[PDB]
Symmetry: D2
Subunit: 131 residues, 4 copies
């Protein structure tokens, strides 16, 4: 047993290849072998969102604050709220972020395959970023 | 892409075989193959706690509300707070719960191994629940 | 500067005359004079709710967990979600609590008028609760 | 009567005269007369904090995420953690904000006295922010 106390895991920023706009990532856990699962709290500023991407064993999102958008490829752009729970299937191309006027914060949970829990792709355009 | 909207998953109660005291279990997500991760929000009334148990692939707690206790065997009873992230190793024997006078809620995340994500053991006695 | 610290204030049961069902009250603050504002976190088990009541200077609810219901007399029963802000106008007879199968938690903020912040009335019947 | 659903109030940025660093203000509520209370959710990025200021009827903080620092003048700087409640007296000169490397979110609740909730004084210097 070990405890990572509050404020002991520093906030980091979203790298510009992977996110449009201002995103802060607050690491929560990365579970050692034989566990595969990792999680972090991600906070998007108004207008911010991830580039298109996929997850090898999928990801679950648990919204914890604010109001944001999310779309799987060829689906519609959905609105998500605190308490909402999202599932993206393995390989499903998708994106998620804040709404244009409000921040959003979510817990993102995903299992790694190699040492690889995400595949990044093209950014989400302004044209694509609408509802 | 699937969304479980807030309020669409019924609250449930912890069965007396697995818990001392009153415990509410709010499921959040589970599975499906090939992914293995499951999660729930677990709320303990003051004085309530899990029985001793283990997890075949480990467990992460993210404390979301109140103030609880937790102890691995051989360890001291720790006090945990919101924003604390707690990890128990695969096979590690332990219990978690509320403190005597305050409720505690946490996000419990674990991976399943051939069907189960917990092995239940004896109750935590009143003498053991002391710190 | 006074800080209380999480875990430091003990939880309480909502008295039977003011609540139907199982309610937990986690006190937060009570400002001294000349300020008038008080706040508590209130947690309603499924199907639990306040009696009908009024607040002499209105009340603001900030839902923090779960899914609840609320109504003023002659109005529709509405769902309240985490992140929602609910305002009850001064003297308006109302009730608020859990949805019938999901718990919920809210921050209740109200100002006291002559050393009182609520007036308690009859319980909300099972019919009024649904209808 | 009224319910402001989550993503319906646009996030705002803290003005440069009142904050050091990047700060987001999410408005929550302002009670109309004869009530005097108002509330916002304020999110400080790592290193960001308010200027020195006072409140005419005092202020209540309820930390909701992350990890932050606070100091009334003549006092030590204190850590505040999620679920902590902080009280500042009317007229008490003080500041609050993020820790140097972790962001922080809190609920700020204060009452207005003839239409003002705060009086703004000088910025907090890098030297005062240490200790
Ligand atoms: Mn994703
Ligand atoms: Mn466990
Ligand atoms: Mn009320
Ligand atoms: Mn202040």
């Amino acid at each position: 047993m070990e405890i990572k106390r509050v404020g002991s895991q520093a906030s980091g920023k979203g790298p510009a290849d992977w996110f449009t706009g201002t995103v802060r990532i607050d690491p929560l856990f990365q579970a050692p072998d034989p566990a595969l699962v990792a999680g972090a709290s991600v906070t998007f500023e108004p207008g911010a969102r991830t580039a298109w991407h996929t997850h090898p064993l999928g990801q679950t999102l648990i919204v914890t604050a604010g109001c944001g958008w999310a779309q799987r490829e060829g689906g519609a752009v959905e609105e998500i709220h605190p308490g909402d729970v999202v599932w993206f299937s393995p390989g499903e191309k998708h994106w998620h972020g804040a709404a244009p006027t409000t921040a959003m914060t979510h817990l993102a949970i995903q299992e790694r395959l190699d040492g690889k829990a995400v595949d990044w792709m093209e950014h989400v355009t302004d044209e694509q970023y609408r509802r």
